[PDB]
Amino acid sequence: RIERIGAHSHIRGLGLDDALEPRQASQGMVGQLAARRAAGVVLEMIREGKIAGRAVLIAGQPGTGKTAIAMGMAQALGPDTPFTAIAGSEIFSLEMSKTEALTQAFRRSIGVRIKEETEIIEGEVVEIQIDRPAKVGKLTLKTTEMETIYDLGTKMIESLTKDKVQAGDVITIDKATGKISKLGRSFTRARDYDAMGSQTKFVQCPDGELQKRKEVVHTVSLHEIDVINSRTQGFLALFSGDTGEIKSEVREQINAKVAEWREEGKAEIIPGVLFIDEVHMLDIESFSFLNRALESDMAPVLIMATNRGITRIRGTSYQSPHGIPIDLLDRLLIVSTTPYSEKDTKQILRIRCEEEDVEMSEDAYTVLTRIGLETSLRYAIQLITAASLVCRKRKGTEVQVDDIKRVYSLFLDESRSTQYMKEYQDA
Amino acid sequence: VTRIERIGAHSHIRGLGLDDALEPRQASQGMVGQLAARRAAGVVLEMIREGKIAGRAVLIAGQPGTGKTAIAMGMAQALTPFTAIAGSEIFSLEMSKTEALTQAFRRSIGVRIKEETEIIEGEVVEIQGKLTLKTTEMETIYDLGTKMIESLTKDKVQAGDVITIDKATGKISKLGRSFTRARDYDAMGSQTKFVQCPDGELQKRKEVVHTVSLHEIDVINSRTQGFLALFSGDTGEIKSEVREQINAKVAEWREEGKAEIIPGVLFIDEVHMLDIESFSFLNRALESDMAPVLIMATNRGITRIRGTSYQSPHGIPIDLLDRLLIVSTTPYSEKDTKQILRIRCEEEDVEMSEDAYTVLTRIGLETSLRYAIQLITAASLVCRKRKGTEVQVDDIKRVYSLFLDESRSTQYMKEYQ
Amino acid sequence: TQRIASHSHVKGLGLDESGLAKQAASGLVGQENAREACGVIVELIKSKKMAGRAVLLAGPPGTGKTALALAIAQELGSKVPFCPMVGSEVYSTEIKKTEVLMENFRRAIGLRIKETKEVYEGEVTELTPCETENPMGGYGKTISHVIIGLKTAKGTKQLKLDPSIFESLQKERVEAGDVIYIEANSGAVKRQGRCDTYATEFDLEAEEYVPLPKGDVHKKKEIIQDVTLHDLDVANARPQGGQDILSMMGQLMKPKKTEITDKLRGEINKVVNKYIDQGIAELVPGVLFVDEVHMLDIECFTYLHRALESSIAPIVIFASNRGNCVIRGTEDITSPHGIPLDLLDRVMIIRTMLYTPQEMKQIIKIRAQTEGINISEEALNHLGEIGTKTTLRYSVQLLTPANLLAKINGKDSIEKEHVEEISELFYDAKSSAKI
Amino acid sequence: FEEWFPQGRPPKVPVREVCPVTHRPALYRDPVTDIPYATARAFKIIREAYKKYITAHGLPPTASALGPGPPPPEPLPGSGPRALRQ
Ligand SMILES: Nc1ncnc2c1ncn2[C@@H]1O[C@H](COP(=O)(O)OP(=O)(O)O)[C@@H](O)[C@H]1O
Ligand SMILES: Nc1ncnc2c1ncn2[C@@H]1O[C@H](COP(=O)(O)OP(=O)(O)O)[C@@H](O)[C@H]1O
Ligand SMILES: Nc1ncnc2c1ncn2[C@@H]1O[C@H](COP(=O)(O)OP(=O)(O)O)[C@@H](O)[C@H]1O
């Protein structure tokens, strides 16, 4: 519950209507109807997943809400669909090539819902009488509507001895493997032992004696390749990034078995999204790889964001729009974000204030909207926070003009920093 | 007999010859000239010895061959941990510049740790269930527990063995029997060497001081410690294990007196080759509490800083120059040159005539000083070839004609291959 | 060993109750607006309401940016963690730059985890009161309860524990006369060792005899452990327990610091939130002071202005010393403070003016005081004058050497002659530029 | 029932031995005389007393050493059950 509000916490989805009509202000967003409708339609395409290898480029001036609309789409997509957010400079690893990192990122945003039929027996253990030779045992499971006694085997008795199960424990035994899983207790333990005090759990299902076809959908991403590349996979799946596995017999074989599962009804493919923020940092080799990697059937939807116009492509000398080669730039379609006006800026500032739980006068809102239209929006939020803190220190109830104007001089913007920078501190 | 260390490039200086009041003499401990630089070296040496402050760096400037490295080696010999390195040593393939520089900084600091434990040692007479430990002045019987019984068997302890056992059931069989060696006429085991029976009280507490540098982070780095202490060791050196554990433990030992730190000196010869990254790291590293006294040497004036196209004095950033006390050296004169040549000849066991010394000084003034320092031994060997007892002008002239100098070498490069 | 560092006089921002700035601000002098901004941002940190916020301590060299940084750090107190980092440390040959930055961000975040355990200890006197066989079945011999006579230093208290634990008692060598470590819920018995009262001087053994427990048998040991999120990341990264990990050749290379985002985020964050909302731990976000930020590559800034966008990112205090300079890793791309113009928009710039000669004199005097050496009025005036001429940091470095020169010359206080002699024995770079 | 529950009496707290020559906490146990001791002088005196005893049937007198205020018993009857050295 203790998680602080970040720069994109004010947004909590992409405000859209039944007909995908964008709204002025909803779900923490304001203005920018065109790019928001583009986000809505690409999100509909993602949730459809019928087509693979689609790319979208979010372009615009800084502070136009590129990362904002990206996080909004991520939120609107909701759980059950992977959304791999990554920065352009994260692919540069000292233990795995750029192409390998891109393959990892692509396969990481693809999920397979594996269906598994289970048969679990549950109930209340009324009698767990076990005859230890130092071989024979019987279990008396009880439910709210029926009871049954089961003769325990040697291995089952040993498993029960492993996980201590006293009378009155709510357990869920899997008839397939016999794994002992304790859920709780139905009553106290004799009220006499001067220890082991806990709370009592609710009774089990009436038909819990034998659940026939308990369906559990195990969801896992296509990053499962780490499970095969090495005999010990937890080390690679948890921390180790040195996963330069062999592409042959791993990628192709896993894809083939995933197709077999999809055809045989075991699992279903759920393509996610790969959001590369500041994609301009990718080397030209990474762009050349994305050009071809984006053509596979397992290719997720590649959302990208650029904050530049004509700029040199990293790893070469010639320039291209958005710092992306002409090929990949032409392949994808671009979503331009128009700057926000004064009203939109004021509304965004008000939404941020509401998020931060801070209140300020109308004149404060006006002067702060002015300052934000002049300097920037993020700087306006910084001033919101600073003025709220100055007001709290001042013992006031709401932020007045005298606090925003004070923190404006206390904290400087880059435009004024460079102005006072004429002291030639260093070069 | 020839040994590992012998007469070298900086062996003539036995130390930083100074008076009680830090008044540099003309030439006492082999070093001559550079009076102001010598007094600065003595001042910084007294500062190091005091250990009242931390994070102080001194830059030794001057033209090539002005005795900067000589003054540094003299201070090191007079100075007790000392770590001398070069700008290329910190550059490691498996360790980033920052990691290597931090390792050097921590290795430049010493730490003394006093250890006091109870010890029981004596000749074993017979075991069993119970031990019968004998010493020169007495003998005692001890009852053996399960752990002691297991240790008596995992290690083949037997009569006559001079055993040793402190607390924590840490038994040791340091060496074998005393008298029984007789019947072992022909062969004697590798580990079964013999020792004299101990004397005094059987159980005795011994206080020992362990001297280790602050670079012990490698010891607490991995599961195995002694292995990494010989070769490069670990390369990671996680910041946490370094600061949150070792520094706090050293502080607690200082508070309770278990340990005491002794800040040394870190001499980085030819610091001009360092990258801007190393300088930026030093800018902060010199601000830490357990920071040793740093010494540097550079022959560069207005030169480019490696890693960037910027130029600054001494080839290093201005950010660091504002943190160093520059001690510039002065080129030697005729008298100083002749005196250092005399000292070099006396140290190398070379005898030369007055005219020979005059010609050698004239050469060392027209050319570099190291050239004449080498001509000394060259003419000595020429005289030995001629079987003469003293080196004359003819020998030094023959050598000057045989071995060329930078100036004459460049002048004779007209061939251009 | 006091081991006075370079600048330790700073103890805090020293702001008045009203939040304004004063001269004697707990060691640090001058810099009114800068110290007020430091107070505002430290109040922010204490609020623990905002995350991923960065501040830039832009200012010419010698303005004491690191000084005020350590001041605000001390003001925060040892309670919240403070991880200092320099731009050079980001360059690692084994782990990528962005992952080092993320590890530093994690270190900057703290987390206090409490742990209360009810345990019973004391000399055991085992005895099983015979009870009629299970009344539900036939007859015979059974045991309905097992009484353990735990004896502590304060007294004795018999515990009628559950009979099923009898297996644990027989498992370990729990004989009458030893100290056992009982657990309330688990019940597992862990023998500490025999009582020292039976440790006869003639018995040769160690780690087997332990003193009697002091206090009541029932002890509710409350312990708190503060570990940063990076500590938990590292702990959950590497394995432990069998699995042939004892190998030396193929395993001694412990520096596998490489880390993935799945483990870093996700499960660890969820378990942290579970411990927080359950009452087992309390999150403590700290601060990440990054000096020499201009030394970072553009590949580092492009990841910084994305990590700062996360809700979990802690407060970052950047301190750039350079001015308009080409960004590292870029082809002649000049930007203010050596930082891309895109990141400067996300940081609050706290400008620091140059110290007034009077402030120079105050700094020199307080540094001399901290060092513990008296300086005469004339010597202090000369030190202030030379600090006005050249960089100020040169003067403070002339105190200890001048102090030693004075002590060796037979005098106590630093006379003007001593500083005058040291200024000729040692000088600054501005004068050394005369090649 | 007996195996899993060896109901044995308490460990019978041992005796706090004392050096008979100096009356201090005994730190050692002489092997030949089987009497505790704490110092080298005590060991020498104990060895001398044992030699005097084994010389004849039984030493009529008793060796005295470090007699405190109260009458020291000069303990001869501190029987050493151990036999001859070898
Ligand atoms: N539509 C919007 N609604 C609310 N805040 C916005 C919007 N657009 C931009 N911002 C704010 O501007 C700052 C930077 O803009 P961002 O959302 O990152 O877009 P960009 O990626 O173009 O900078 C952020 O702090 C963000 O909160
Ligand atoms: N004052 C001096 N006393 C003794 N030897 C000196 C003195 N000055 C220079 N030398 C000799 O000069 C030689 C080379 O000088 P060097 O230390 O390389 O100069 P730099 O300090 O510029 O590196 C050394 O072998 C050293 O013996
Ligand atoms: N206001 C001040 N009061 C006292 N000392 C100061 C002050 N400002 C700077 N200093 C001194 O300046 C020295 C270093 O300052 P620092 O924080 O490193 O600035 P920079 O990093 O820009 O060089 C410190 O040793 C400190 O003693």
GROMACS .gro file of N, CA, C and O in nm, chain B residues 36 40 47 50 52-54 56 94 96 98 143 147-148 168-169 223-224 227 234-235 239 243 254 263 276-277 280-281 284 287 289 291 310 314 319 322-323 325-328, chain C residues 1-4 6-7 83-84 86 88-89 91 93-94 202 204 206-208 246-247 251-252 255 291 321 325-326 328 371 393 397 400-401 404 425-429 432:
model
  332
  463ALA      N    1   6.367   2.315  -0.169
  463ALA     CA    2   6.227   2.345  -0.143
  463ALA      C    3   6.140   2.221  -0.158
  463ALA      O    4   6.051   2.196  -0.076
  467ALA      N    5   5.914   2.042   0.131
  467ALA     CA    6   5.773   2.009   0.111
  467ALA      C    7   5.748   1.861   0.134
  467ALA      O    8   5.647   1.822   0.195
  474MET      N    9   5.293   1.532   0.806
  474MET     CA   10   5.147   1.529   0.803
  474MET      C   11   5.095   1.386   0.800
  474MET      O   12   5.002   1.351   0.872
  477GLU      N   13   5.138   1.224   1.133
  477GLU     CA   14   5.042   1.273   1.232
  477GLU      C   15   4.910   1.199   1.222
  477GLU      O   16   4.853   1.158   1.323
  479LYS      N   17   4.625   1.323   1.154
  479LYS     CA   18   4.518   1.402   1.214
  479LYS      C   19   4.403   1.426   1.117
  479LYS      O   20   4.289   1.445   1.161
  480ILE      N   21   4.431   1.426   0.987
  480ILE     CA   22   4.331   1.455   0.884
  480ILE      C   23   4.332   1.342   0.782
  480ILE      O   24   4.412   1.249   0.788
  481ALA      N   25   4.240   1.353   0.686
  481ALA     CA   26   4.227   1.255   0.579
  481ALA      C   27   4.190   1.326   0.449
  481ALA      O   28   4.136   1.437   0.450
  483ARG      N   29   4.404   1.415   0.173
  483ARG     CA   30   4.499   1.517   0.130
  483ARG      C   31   4.584   1.461   0.017
  483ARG      O   32   4.639   1.351   0.028
  521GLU      N   33   3.949  -0.693  -1.635
  521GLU     CA   34   3.843  -0.755  -1.557
  521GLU      C   35   3.793  -0.666  -1.444
  521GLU      O   36   3.693  -0.701  -1.379
  523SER      N   37   3.698  -0.251  -1.361
  523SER     CA   38   3.687  -0.113  -1.408
  523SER      C   39   3.788  -0.025  -1.337
  523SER      O   40   3.837  -0.057  -1.229
  525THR      N   41   3.744   0.245  -1.178
  525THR     CA   42   3.697   0.283  -1.045
  525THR      C   43   3.723   0.173  -0.943
  525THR      O   44   3.769   0.200  -0.832
  570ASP      N   45   3.957  -3.460   3.013
  570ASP     CA   46   3.850  -3.543   2.960
  570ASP      C   47   3.810  -3.494   2.822
  570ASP      O   48   3.795  -3.374   2.799
  574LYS      N   49   3.329  -3.408   2.033
  574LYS     CA   50   3.401  -3.332   1.931
  574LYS      C   51   3.551  -3.354   1.942
  574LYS      O   52   3.619  -3.372   1.840
  575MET      N   53   3.604  -3.352   2.064
  575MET     CA   54   3.747  -3.376   2.083
  575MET      C   55   3.784  -3.518   2.041
  575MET      O   56   3.890  -3.541   1.982
  595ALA      N   57   3.688  -2.327   2.102
  595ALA     CA   58   3.618  -2.363   1.979
  595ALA      C   59   3.669  -2.494   1.920
  595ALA      O   60   3.667  -2.511   1.797
  596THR      N   61   3.717  -2.585   2.005
  596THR     CA   62   3.763  -2.718   1.964
  596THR      C   63   3.851  -2.713   1.840
  596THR      O   64   3.848  -2.806   1.758
  650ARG      N   65   3.312  -1.707  -0.061
  650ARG     CA   66   3.316  -1.818   0.034
  650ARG      C   67   3.459  -1.856   0.070
  650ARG      O   68   3.488  -1.881   0.188
  651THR      N   69   3.548  -1.861  -0.028
  651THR     CA   70   3.689  -1.889  -0.005
  651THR      C   71   3.766  -1.757  -0.004
  651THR      O   72   3.748  -1.674  -0.094
  654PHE      N   73   4.228  -1.787  -0.116
  654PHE     CA   74   4.256  -1.804  -0.258
  654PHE      C   75   4.264  -1.669  -0.329
  654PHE      O   76   4.361  -1.642  -0.401
  661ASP      N   77   3.868  -1.118  -0.639
  661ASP     CA   78   3.738  -1.084  -0.694
  661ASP      C   79   3.743  -0.949  -0.764
  661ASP      O   80   3.822  -0.861  -0.728
  662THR      N   81   3.658  -0.933  -0.865
  662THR     CA   82   3.650  -0.810  -0.943
  662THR      C   83   3.529  -0.725  -0.909
  662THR      O   84   3.533  -0.603  -0.930
  666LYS      N   85   2.954  -0.255  -0.354
  666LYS     CA   86   2.963  -0.137  -0.268
  666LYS      C   87   2.915  -0.168  -0.127
  666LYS      O   88   2.974  -0.122  -0.028
  670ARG      N   89   3.130  -0.094   0.216
  670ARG     CA   90   3.107   0.020   0.305
  670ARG      C   91   3.022  -0.018   0.427
  670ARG      O   92   3.057   0.015   0.540
  681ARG      N   93   3.760   0.006   1.641
  681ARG     CA   94   3.828   0.124   1.693
  681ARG      C   95   3.763   0.173   1.821
  681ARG      O   96   3.833   0.207   1.918
  690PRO      N   97   4.672   0.526   0.849
  690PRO     CA   98   4.665   0.568   0.708
  690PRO      C   99   4.804   0.575   0.646
  690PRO      O  100   4.895   0.639   0.700
  703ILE      N  101   3.955   1.101  -1.748
  703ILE     CA  102   3.870   1.196  -1.676
  703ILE      C  103   3.780   1.122  -1.577
  703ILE      O  104   3.741   1.178  -1.474
  704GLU      N  105   3.747   0.996  -1.607
  704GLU     CA  106   3.665   0.918  -1.515
  704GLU      C  107   3.738   0.898  -1.382
  704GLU      O  108   3.679   0.913  -1.275
  707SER      N  109   3.740   1.226  -1.189
  707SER     CA  110   3.609   1.255  -1.132
  707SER      C  111   3.580   1.165  -1.013
  707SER      O  112   3.518   1.209  -0.915
  708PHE      N  113   3.624   1.039  -1.018
  708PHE     CA  114   3.606   0.950  -0.904
  708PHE      C  115   3.691   0.996  -0.786
  708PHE      O  116   3.644   0.998  -0.672
  711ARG      N  117   3.566   1.267  -0.544
  711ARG     CA  118   3.481   1.227  -0.433
  711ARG      C  119   3.555   1.136  -0.335
  711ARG      O  120   3.540   1.149  -0.213
  714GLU      N  121   3.720   1.274  -0.048
  714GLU     CA  122   3.632   1.334   0.051
  714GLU      C  123   3.590   1.236   0.160
  714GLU      O  124   3.530   1.279   0.259
  716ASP      N  125   3.613   0.954   0.474
  716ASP     CA  126   3.681   0.958   0.603
  716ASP      C  127   3.812   0.879   0.598
  716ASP      O  128   3.920   0.933   0.626
  718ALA      N  129   4.040   0.798   0.393
  718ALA     CA  130   4.110   0.829   0.270
  718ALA      C  131   4.258   0.850   0.299
  718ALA      O  132   4.291   0.932   0.386
  737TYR      N  133   4.015   1.836  -2.419
  737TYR     CA  134   4.044   1.953  -2.338
  737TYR      C  135   4.188   1.952  -2.289
  737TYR      O  136   4.247   1.846  -2.267
  741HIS      N  137   4.923   2.030  -1.627
  741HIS     CA  138   4.959   1.896  -1.583
  741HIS      C  139   4.877   1.788  -1.650
  741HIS      O  140   4.882   1.671  -1.608
  746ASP      N  141   3.914   2.064  -1.194
  746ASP     CA  142   3.839   2.029  -1.074
  746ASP      C  143   3.930   1.967  -0.968
  746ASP      O  144   3.914   1.993  -0.848
  749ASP      N  145   4.241   2.208  -0.809
  749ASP     CA  146   4.203   2.288  -0.694
  749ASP      C  147   4.205   2.208  -0.564
  749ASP      O  148   4.171   2.264  -0.458
  750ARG      N  149   4.243   2.081  -0.568
  750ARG     CA  150   4.247   1.996  -0.450
  750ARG      C  151   4.387   1.947  -0.418
  750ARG      O  152   4.404   1.872  -0.321
  752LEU      N  153   4.820   2.018  -0.361
  752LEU     CA  154   4.928   2.111  -0.328
  752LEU      C  155   5.045   2.080  -0.420
  752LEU      O  156   5.111   1.977  -0.405
  753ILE      N  157   5.071   2.169  -0.515
  753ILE     CA  158   5.172   2.145  -0.617
  753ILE      C  159   5.310   2.171  -0.558
  753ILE      O  160   5.336   2.278  -0.502
  754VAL      N  161   5.399   2.073  -0.572
  754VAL     CA  162   5.537   2.084  -0.526
  754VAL      C  163   5.625   2.068  -0.649
  754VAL      O  164   5.659   1.956  -0.689
  755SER      N  165   5.662   2.180  -0.711
  755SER     CA  166   5.742   2.176  -0.832
  755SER      C  167   5.890   2.167  -0.797
  755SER      O  168   5.937   2.230  -0.702
  845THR      N  169   3.997   0.710   1.674
  845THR     CA  170   4.065   0.800   1.577
  845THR      C  171   3.965   0.892   1.509
  845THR      O  172   3.883   0.848   1.428
  846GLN      N  173   3.971   1.021   1.543
  846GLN     CA  174   3.880   1.118   1.482
  846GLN      C  175   3.889   1.114   1.330
  846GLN      O  176   3.786   1.114   1.261
  847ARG      N  177   4.011   1.108   1.276
  847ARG     CA  178   4.035   1.102   1.132
  847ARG      C  179   3.950   1.206   1.059
  847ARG      O  180   3.861   1.174   0.980
  848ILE      N  181   3.979   1.333   1.087
  848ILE     CA  182   3.906   1.442   1.024
  848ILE      C  183   3.916   1.429   0.873
  848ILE      O  184   4.026   1.418   0.817
  850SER      N  185   3.796   1.563   0.465
  850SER     CA  186   3.816   1.689   0.394
  850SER      C  187   3.722   1.797   0.447
  850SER      O  188   3.766   1.903   0.490
  851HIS      N  189   3.591   1.770   0.443
  851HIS     CA  190   3.489   1.865   0.487
  851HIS      C  191   3.390   1.790   0.575
  851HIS      O  192   3.290   1.735   0.527
  927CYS      N  193   2.281   0.688  -0.008
  927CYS     CA  194   2.381   0.621  -0.091
  927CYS      C  195   2.453   0.724  -0.177
  927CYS      O  196   2.395   0.772  -0.276
  928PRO      N  197   2.577   0.762  -0.145
  928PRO     CA  198   2.650   0.854  -0.233
  928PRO      C  199   2.710   0.780  -0.351
  928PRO      O  200   2.761   0.668  -0.337
  930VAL      N  201   2.919   0.856  -0.754
  930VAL     CA  202   2.981   0.945  -0.850
  930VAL      C  203   2.960   0.888  -0.990
  930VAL      O  204   2.946   0.767  -1.008
  932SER      N  205   3.149   0.830  -1.225
  932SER     CA  206   3.248   0.735  -1.273
  932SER      C  207   3.214   0.592  -1.231
  932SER      O  208   3.244   0.497  -1.303
  933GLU      N  209   3.152   0.577  -1.114
  933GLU     CA  210   3.119   0.443  -1.065
  933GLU      C  211   3.020   0.371  -1.155
  933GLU      O  212   3.009   0.248  -1.148
  935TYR      N  213   3.039   0.332  -1.472
  935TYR     CA  214   3.113   0.259  -1.575
  935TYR      C  215   3.166   0.130  -1.513
  935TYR      O  216   3.266   0.131  -1.441
  937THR      N  217   3.272  -0.284  -1.599
  937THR     CA  218   3.311  -0.375  -1.707
  937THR      C  219   3.234  -0.507  -1.704
  937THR      O  220   3.235  -0.579  -1.804
  938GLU      N  221   3.170  -0.540  -1.592
  938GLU     CA  222   3.097  -0.665  -1.579
  938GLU      C  223   2.946  -0.649  -1.589
  938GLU      O  224   2.878  -0.742  -1.631
 1046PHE      N  225   3.811  -2.958   3.421
 1046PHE     CA  226   3.888  -3.069   3.367
 1046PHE      C  227   3.828  -3.128   3.240
 1046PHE      O  228   3.892  -3.213   3.178
 1048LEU      N  229   3.752  -3.110   2.862
 1048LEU     CA  230   3.807  -3.041   2.746
 1048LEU      C  231   3.705  -3.048   2.633
 1048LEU      O  232   3.690  -3.151   2.568
 1050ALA      N  233   3.450  -2.744   2.373
 1050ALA     CA  234   3.406  -2.608   2.347
 1050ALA      C  235   3.280  -2.610   2.262
 1050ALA      O  236   3.252  -2.708   2.192
 1051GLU      N  237   3.204  -2.501   2.269
 1051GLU     CA  238   3.083  -2.485   2.191
 1051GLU      C  239   2.973  -2.580   2.238
 1051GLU      O  240   2.865  -2.585   2.178
 1052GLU      N  241   2.999  -2.655   2.345
 1052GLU     CA  242   2.901  -2.748   2.400
 1052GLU      C  243   2.837  -2.698   2.529
 1052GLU      O  244   2.724  -2.739   2.560
 1090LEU      N  245   2.931  -2.601  -0.386
 1090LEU     CA  246   3.061  -2.597  -0.320
 1090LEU      C  247   3.178  -2.598  -0.418
 1090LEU      O  248   3.292  -2.581  -0.375
 1091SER      N  249   3.152  -2.618  -0.547
 1091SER     CA  250   3.260  -2.619  -0.645
 1091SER      C  251   3.338  -2.489  -0.641
 1091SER      O  252   3.285  -2.382  -0.608
 1095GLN      N  253   3.251  -2.205  -1.006
 1095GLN     CA  254   3.160  -2.125  -0.925
 1095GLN      C  255   3.226  -2.010  -0.851
 1095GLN      O  256   3.156  -1.916  -0.811
 1096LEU      N  257   3.358  -2.012  -0.831
 1096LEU     CA  258   3.424  -1.908  -0.753
 1096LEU      C  259   3.404  -1.769  -0.812
 1096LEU      O  260   3.418  -1.670  -0.740
 1099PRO      N  261   3.119  -1.269  -0.911
 1099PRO     CA  262   3.067  -1.144  -0.969
 1099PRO      C  263   2.974  -1.168  -1.087
 1099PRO      O  264   3.010  -1.143  -1.203
 1135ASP      N  265   2.694   1.292  -0.758
 1135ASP     CA  266   2.782   1.401  -0.796
 1135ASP      C  267   2.855   1.367  -0.925
 1135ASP      O  268   2.870   1.250  -0.962
 1165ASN      N  269   2.923   1.993  -1.172
 1165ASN     CA  270   3.023   2.098  -1.151
 1165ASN      C  271   3.065   2.166  -1.280
 1165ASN      O  272   3.102   2.284  -1.276
 1169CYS      N  273   2.908   2.193  -2.187
 1169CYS     CA  274   3.007   2.100  -2.238
 1169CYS      C  275   2.937   1.993  -2.321
 1169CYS      O  276   2.818   1.967  -2.305
 1170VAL      N  277   3.014   1.932  -2.412
 1170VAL     CA  278   2.959   1.827  -2.497
 1170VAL      C  279   2.924   1.706  -2.413
 1170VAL      O  280   3.002   1.663  -2.327
 1172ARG      N  281   2.895   1.339  -2.298
 1172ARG     CA  282   2.979   1.223  -2.321
 1172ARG      C  283   2.905   1.120  -2.406
 1172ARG      O  284   2.784   1.100  -2.391
 1215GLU      N  285   3.985   2.158   1.293
 1215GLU     CA  286   4.116   2.093   1.300
 1215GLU      C  287   4.173   2.098   1.440
 1215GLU      O  288   4.250   2.009   1.479
 1237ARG      N  289   3.963   2.637  -0.169
 1237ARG     CA  290   4.006   2.509  -0.114
 1237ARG      C  291   4.156   2.505  -0.088
 1237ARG      O  292   4.202   2.419  -0.011
 1241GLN      N  293   4.360   2.388   0.298
 1241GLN     CA  294   4.467   2.289   0.296
 1241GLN      C  295   4.597   2.343   0.354
 1241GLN      O  296   4.688   2.264   0.383
 1244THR      N  297   4.669   2.261   0.822
 1244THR     CA  298   4.745   2.152   0.882
 1244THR      C  299   4.895   2.164   0.857
 1244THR      O  300   4.972   2.151   0.954
 1245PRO      N  301   4.943   2.187   0.734
 1245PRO     CA  302   5.088   2.203   0.717
 1245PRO      C  303   5.144   2.323   0.792
 1245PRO      O  304   5.251   2.313   0.852
 1248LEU      N  305   5.167   2.225   1.157
 1248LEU     CA  306   5.283   2.142   1.186
 1248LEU      C  307   5.412   2.223   1.182
 1248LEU      O  308   5.501   2.204   1.265
 1269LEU      N  309   5.636   2.751  -0.010
 1269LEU     CA  310   5.669   2.610  -0.020
 1269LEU      C  311   5.564   2.535  -0.101
 1269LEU      O  312   5.598   2.449  -0.183
 1270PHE      N  313   5.437   2.565  -0.078
 1270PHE     CA  314   5.326   2.510  -0.155
 1270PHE      C  315   5.245   2.623  -0.215
 1270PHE      O  316   5.219   2.725  -0.150
 1271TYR      N  317   5.204   2.606  -0.341
 1271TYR     CA  318   5.121   2.704  -0.409
 1271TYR      C  319   5.015   2.629  -0.489
 1271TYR      O  320   5.012   2.505  -0.491
 1272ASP      N  321   4.928   2.704  -0.555
 1272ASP     CA  322   4.810   2.651  -0.623
 1272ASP      C  323   4.841   2.626  -0.770
 1272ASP      O  324   4.955   2.639  -0.816
 1273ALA      N  325   4.737   2.589  -0.845
 1273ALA     CA  326   4.754   2.561  -0.987
 1273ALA      C  327   4.759   2.690  -1.069
 1273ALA      O  328   4.832   2.697  -1.168
 1276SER      N  329   5.094   2.773  -1.070
 1276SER     CA  330   5.171   2.669  -1.136
 1276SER      C  331   5.155   2.673  -1.288
 1276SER      O  332   5.236   2.613  -1.359
   0.00000   0.00000   0.00000
